[PDB]
């Protein structure tokens, strides 16, 4: 799994430990080993949500499987909770796009997962 | 809806008002309320289009519905027009990827937009 | 086609001519002409792979067609080889997401690549 967060929150507001917490909690939530979890945090972005530049986040989660109705609702509660707690971003100013990737469409280690 | 612009145009060339104009014109174009429109502009990028580092942009628009043949052509005319006018980027050096997102695959406000079944 | 590389490798470690080399290698690999290849490299990123902040890359390749099982395997060998050689990133710390785009879902030059129907 691969999680990306883009936010206008300043880099200094990103707490020590944040990447590791995302790695560990996403490993739990998706049921995949932590060694395969990739996380990417992009602070200080020029963005608006609803025409306002108050804190907001635009995110994505790509996973080979483990994507669906109930699972995505769970991921959103977990991730919005983390963004609210750690970056002080309001949940209703977060978007998360979920992608269920075909193993043939994911490259890794000179090949693909198919 | 969510619109992202990545460009090698410098931040100083992004005009006052640009995010708001994108927000409002996208609300108008998609028929979605302005409150739900998110915009993200990323200047000063290291990128090339056709091997040339002349001004270019790589963009995406994600929407739950309102994606399709004629609508996407209309979005492209609007967005290329804005990028040409405001950032001075040639329309033929712009790519825009359109994504029709399923409501169940979009997170917001502690949940998703699939609130009908559980 | 559009290739994006996001990495925690520093900007100064990105060799001059990297974007041009990616352009040429991708044109060759996809069969699409160089003029239509777009490349974007984003260094100095805050990211981890498997919990480690050693060099890694998260990438995407979008193409209208020319995406699939065998071809994606070939692309991965090519792109990982390039990232390993040029950016000194180990192949098992690289992810590449492949996207087969519909022509109607790619905007360019004030329209899309769906020019056949109205
Ligand atoms: O899902 C993944 C995995 C993955 C992690 C653990 C596994 O056991 C497995 O088969 C696949 C690895 O990298 C990815 C990169 C992506 O852009 C999307 C999904 C994944």
Q: Do the beta carbons of residue B30 and residue B63 sit within 8 Å?
A: yes
Burial class (CB in 10 A: 0-12, 13-18, 19+), C12: exposed
Evaluate: CB of A32 within 6 angstroms of ligand 1. yes
Across C70-107, b (16+ Cβ under 10 Å) vs e yields ebbbebbbbbbebbbebbebebebbbbbbbbbeebbbb
Cα angle value C42/A49/C47 (rounded, 5°): 30
Pair of tokens at residue B25:
């014109």
Cα pseudo-dihedral C62, C66, C69, C75, rounded to 10: -60
Q: Among A61, B109, A46, A2, which residue's Cα sits nearest to residue C47? A: A2
Q: Do the beta carbons of residue B49 and residue C38 sit within 8 Å?
A: yes
Cβ-defined contact of A96 to B104 (cutoff 8 Å): no
DSSP per position, C46-111: EEEETTB-SS-EEEEEEESS--SHHHHHHHHHHHHHHHHHHH---GGGEEEEEEE--GGGEEETTE
Q: Do the beta carbons of residue C43 and residue C9 sit within 8 Å?
A: yes
Q: Do the beta carbons of residue C37 and residue C27 sit within 8 Å?
A: yes
Evaluate: CB of C97 within 6 angstroms of ligand 1. yes
Query: According to the CATH classification, is domain A1-114 in 3.40.50.1100?
Result: no
> Distances from the Cα of C3 to the Cαs of A95, A105, C60, C75, in angstroms?
24, 14, 6, 11
Residue C27 belongs to what H/E stretch?
helix C18-30
Q: Do the beta carbons of residue C59 and residue C94 sit within 8 Å?
A: yes
Cβ-defined contact of B95 to C104 (cutoff 8 Å): no
Half-sphere exposure of B18 (CA within 13 A, CB side): 24
Pair of tokens at residue B15:
């005009």
> Distances from the Cα of A41 to the Cαs of A46, A64, C70, in angstroms?
14, 21, 32
CB nearest A98 (choices: B34, B40, B107): B107
The CA R_g of chain C, rounded to the nearest whole Å, is: 15
CA B2 from chain centre, in angstroms, equals 6
Look up the CATH architecture of domain B1-118: 2-Layer Sandwich (3.30)
Domain residue ranges of chain B, discontinuous segments joined by +: 1-118
DSSP, res A10: -
Q: Is C115 helix (H, G, I), strand (E, B) or coil?
A: coil
Q: Do the beta carbons of residue A35 and residue A3 sit within 8 Å?
A: no
CA B57 from chain centre, in angstroms, equals 10
Q: Do the beta carbons of residue C46 and residue A42 sit within 8 Å?
A: yes
The CA R_g of chain A, rounded to the nearest whole Å, is: 14
CA dihedral over C107, C111, C113, C114, signed as positive or negative: positive
Solved with: X-ray
Contacts of C59 (CB under 8 A, 6+ apart): A107, C3, C4, C5, C6, C79, C83, C94, C95, C96, C97
Cα gap C87→A110, rounded to integer Å:
15
Resolution in A: 1.9
Pair of tokens at residue C32:
């699409």
């Amino acid at each position: 799994p691969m999680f990306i967060v883009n936010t206008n929150v300043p880099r200094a507001s990103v707490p020590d430990g944040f990447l590791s917490e995302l790695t560990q909690q996403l490993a739990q939530a998706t049921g995949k080993p932590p060694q395969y979890i990739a996380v990417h945090v992009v602070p200080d972005q020029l963005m608006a949500f609803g025409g306002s530049s108050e804190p907001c986040a635009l995110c994505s989660l790509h996973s080979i499987g483990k994507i669906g109705g109930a699972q995505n609702r769970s991921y959103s509660k977990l991730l919005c909770g983390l963004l609210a707690e750690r970056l002080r971003i309001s949940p209703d100013r977060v978007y998360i796009n979920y992608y269920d990737m075909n193993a043939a469409n994911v490259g890794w280690n000179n090949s693909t997962f198919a």
